[PDB]
Amino acid sequence: RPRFSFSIAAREGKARTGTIEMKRGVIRTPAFMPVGTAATVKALKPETVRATGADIILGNTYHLMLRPGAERIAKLGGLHSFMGWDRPILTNSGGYQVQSEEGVTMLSPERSIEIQHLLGSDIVMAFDECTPYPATPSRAASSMERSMRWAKRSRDAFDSRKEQAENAALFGIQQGSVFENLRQQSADALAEIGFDGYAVGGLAVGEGQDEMFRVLDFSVPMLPDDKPHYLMGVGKPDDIVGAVERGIDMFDCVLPTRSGRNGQAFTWDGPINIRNARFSEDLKPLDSECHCAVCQKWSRAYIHHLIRAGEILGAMLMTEHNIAFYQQLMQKIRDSISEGRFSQFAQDFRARYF
Amino acid sequence: RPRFSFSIAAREGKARTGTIEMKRGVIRTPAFMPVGTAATVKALKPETVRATGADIILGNTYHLMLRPGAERIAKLGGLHSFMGWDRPILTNSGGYQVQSEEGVTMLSPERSIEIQHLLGSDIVMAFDECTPYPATPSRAASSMERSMRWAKRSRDAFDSRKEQAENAALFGIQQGSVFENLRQQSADALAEIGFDGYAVGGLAVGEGQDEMFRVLDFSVPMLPDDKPHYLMGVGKPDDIVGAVERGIDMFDCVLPTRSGRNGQAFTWDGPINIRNARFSEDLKPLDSECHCAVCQKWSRAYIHHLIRAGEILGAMLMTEHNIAFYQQLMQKIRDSISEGRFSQFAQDFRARYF
Ligand SMILES: CNc1nc2cc3nc[nH]c(=O)c3cc2[nH]1
Ligand SMILES: CNc1nc2cc3nc[nH]c(=O)c3cc2[nH]1
Ligand SMILES: [Zn+2]
Ligand SMILES: [Zn+2]
C-alpha cells in the first residue's frame, strides 16, 4: 500500500468513479466522509460507522486543538488509537471554525499542519481563508491570494516533516468566490505548488444550490483531472448527486448526524421528520428499501417515541440510519457511473426524491 | 417452556442459585435486571443489553402509561416488539413513581394490572403502597394492610384475564417498614393469596445498608422458600452481595445506567469517577479484568474526554461497561454459590471493593 494513489476506473461525462489507496486503507470514490466532531462520530461506535460502509471519516481539528489539545492525543497514540478507528482520517485545518498574514489569533498554516500531524491525520488540509458570501471581487481576490500564500506555507510545512510527508497526503483548497477568473488563478497557483488532492472551498456558505452548481460548472474543470476533487461541507443528497455530475469525488457534511439527532431521517422519497405525529403508529421502517440494521429491526413509531422522549437510543438509531443512507447513495452513484447509467440514476433519483 | 417454573440448583446458607423458566426464556438467579426507562435501556440497543448477559430487563410502566400510553404500545404489538427485546420483561405497577382505598388519582390495582397486560409483561408486579421511611408503627401497619388488600385485588385482576394468567407470572410485595411483626403479617397474607414470586418492598428508601440488611435478616425467611425473592430498587454491588447472602434472588437498579451517564464506572477495586483529572492520560481500560467490549477496546483517557465533552458515545460506553460489570458480578455470585464458595467470594469481594 502506497502513501497515496488515485486511480480512476470509470467515467461518465464529468463524473468519475475509482479508488484512493493509502497506507491505512482504500477509499471508494465518490466518497462520503462521516464527520467526527470531537474524536467521535456522534452517537456511533467506529465499528458501526464502518459497518454502514464508510471508508474514511473526517476528524474535526478545531475542538480537539482546545480539548484535549493535540499534544495529549499525540501522547496517547494519535486519534486513530484514541477513538478506535484504524482506517484513513481526513483532518480539517481548524481555521474554518475559528486575523493577519501570519494566521489567526494563534493559529497559522505551520501550526495547523503540525496539529494535524500530532493527531496522525492521513489526509491533511492546507490552512486557508474561506471567503464569506457574498464577497466583492476585491475582497474575494485578497482572500484568495492570502489563501494561496498560506497554501504554499502549508506544503512547505508538510514537506519539512519527514514522517508526515512519507505517510500522509496533502490537499490544497481553491477559493475565488463566484468569480471565474479568480477560481482559475487559484487553480493555477495550487497546481503550481502541487497537491495530492484539490478541494473546492468557499461553497456551502449561503449561496443556494443553483449558484453553487454554477460555480462548480466552471471551477472543477480547472483542477487537475488526475487528482481527487473534494467539495468541503456538502451536503444534502441532491447536492451530492449534482456535484458528482460536475466532477466531485469527495464529500463531508454534518447533516446526516446532526439532522438525525434533531429527528430528520433521509429516505429515497425525501427527508422526513420522524417527530411528526403522523409517524406515531407507523410500523414501517424509516425507509422501505434501506438495508441498514435500524431499518431491519425498528419501526418509525418506535423511533418517533424515542426522539420525542429525548432518548439516546433515538439519536443512535437515527444517526446509524442516515449515515447508512448516505453510504448507500454513494454506492449507487459509484455503480451507476461504472455501468454508464449515472445520468439516468441522477434523474431517477431527483424524480423520486422530490 | 412453561408459564413459570423456579428451580433451585444449589444453596449456601441463605443464598441460592437456580433458574426461572418462562415462555420467553430462562432466567439465571441471582439475577440483575437492567432498568428500561421509557421502552429502552438508556443508551443501549437490546442486543447489547443481551450481549452483556442480561436474561431479563425491567420495563418501567410509569413513563409509558403517560407516553405513548399503554394502549398505543398494545396497538403496535406490545413492548417486546416495540423496543426489540424478545426475552422476559418484568414490569413495575407504576404506583411507586406516582390517594384512597380505590387507588391513586386515576391508577388502581385493576388498572395497573391491565396496563402491564397491554404492555405484554412477563412478570407483573402487584400494585402496592411503598411506605415512606421512617414510618411510625401505626402508619406502617395501615400502609401494609392496604397493600395487602391491593395485593388480593391484583391477583383477582390478573386471574380474571385468561391470556395474562396463562402466559405471565404475578409477584406480590411485602411491606411492613422495619417492624418484624408487620413483615410477618404481610408475608402471611401474601402467602395466603399466593404468588409466583415475592418481593421485599419498602427498602432502598433512605434507611442505610445496615438497617436494610437487618430487615432482610428477619424478613426474607418469612417468604416462601420455594419462590423467587426480589429486592426492589437495589442496588450497589455491595448491597447486592449482602442481600444474596440474605436469600435474595432478584435485583433491579438504575445505578449502573444513570451513574454511567454521570461518569461513574464500577470496578472490582471500587467505583471511579472517570471525569476526574487523574484519568486524563490513563490508557488502561475502565477495569483491569472486565471482559466487556468497552474494556477490550477503549481507554479511560478516551472515555474521560467523551464524558467531559458531553458526547453520546460516552454515555453508551460507560453504560455498556457498567451493565456488563453487574452481570459479571451476578455470574460470580452464581458460580461461587454453586461451588459452595460464596461466603469466601463475598469476603474477598468486599475486601477488594473497599
Ligand atoms: C458547510 N459549508 C462549508 N463548510 C466549509 C468548510 C471549509 N473549510 C475550509 N475551507 C473552506 O472554503 C470551507 C468551506 C466550507 N463550506
Ligand atoms: C430505589 N429504592 C426503591 N425503589 C423501590 C420501588 C418500589 N416499588 C414498589 N414497591 C416498593 O416497596 C418499592 C420500594 C423501592 N425502593
Ligand atoms: Zn435504514
Ligand atoms: Zn468493561
Residue of B40, B299, B313 lying closest to A40 (CB–CB): B313
Sign of the C-alpha dihedral, residues A96, A98, A103, A109?
Answer: negative
Report yes or no: A89 and A56 within 8 Å, Cβ to Cβ.
yes
The reply to whether A74 touches chain B by the CB within 8 Å rule is no
The reply to whether A76 touches chain B by the CB within 8 Å rule is yes
This entry's atomic model was obtained through X-ray
* Cα–Cα distance, A145 to A139 (Å, whole number): 10
Alpha-carbon distance values, B202 to B26, B117, B216 (Å): 28, 25, 11
DSSP conformation letters of B25-77: EEEEESEEEEEETTSS-TT--HHHHHHTT-S-EEE-HHHHHHTT-HHHHHHTT
* Cα–Cα distance, A324 to A294 (Å, whole number): 9
Report yes or no: B243 and B327 within 8 Å, Cβ to Cβ.
no
Report yes or no: A312 and B310 within 8 Å, Cβ to Cβ.
no
* Cα–Cα distance, B255 to B226 (Å, whole number): 29
Q: Residue count of chain A, please give it.
A: 354
Ligand 1, atom 11: closest residue by C-alpha: A201
Q: Give this entry's resolution in angstroms.
A: 2.0
CB-CB neighbours of A251 under 10 Å: 24
* Cα–Cα distance, A13 to B146 (Å, whole number): 80
CATH number of the domain encompassing residue B83: 3.20.20.105
Residues of A in contact with B63 (CB under 8 A): 309
Task: Mention every residue, 6+ apart, whose C-beta is less than 8 A from residue A350.
Answer: A238, A241
C-alpha cell at B137: 408503627
From the CA of B295, the nearest ligand is 4
Residue of B45, B68, B298 lying closest to A305 (CB–CB): B68
* Cα–Cα distance, B307 to B322 (Å, whole number): 14
> What is the chain B residue with the closest CA to A47?
B297
Task: Mention every residue, 6+ apart, whose C-beta is less than 8 A from residue B347.
Answer: none
DSSP conformation letters of B146-198: HHHHHHHHHHHHHHH-HHHHHH-EEEEEE--TT-HHHHHHHHHHHHHH--SEE
Chain A, window 47-66: residues with a beta carbon less than 8 angstroms from a chain B beta carbon: 63
CB-CB neighbours of B256 under 10 Å: 28
Strand A264-265 relative to strand A89-91, pairing: unpaired
Tally the domains of chain A.
1
Exposure string for B305-326, b = 16+ CB within 10 A, e = fewer: bbbbbebbbbbbbbbbbbbbbb
Can you give A187-201 as a three-state secondary structure string? HHHHHHHCCCEEEEC
Beta bridge partners of A230: A199, A250
> Which structural domain, as residue segments, surrounds residue B112?
1-354
* Cα–Cα distance, A45 to A52 (Å, whole number): 11
* Cα–Cα distance, B186 to B326 (Å, whole number): 31
- Listed residue (A127, A223, A216) closest to A178, CA to CA: A216
The reply to whether B302 touches chain A by the CB within 8 Å rule is yes
Atom of ligand 1 nearest to the CA of A130: 12
DSSP class of residue B222 equals G
- Decide if B313 and A281 are in contact by the 8 Å CB cutoff: no
Alpha-carbon distance values, A96 to A63, A200, A205, B177 (Å): 12, 14, 11, 63
C-alpha cell at A73: 492525543
From the CA of B143, the nearest ligand is 2
Cis peptide before B235, with omega less than 30 degrees from 0? yes
Which of A41, A45, A57, A279 would best serve as a mutation to test chain B binding (most B beta carbons within 10 A)?
A45
Min Cα–Cα distance to chain A from B34, Å: 15
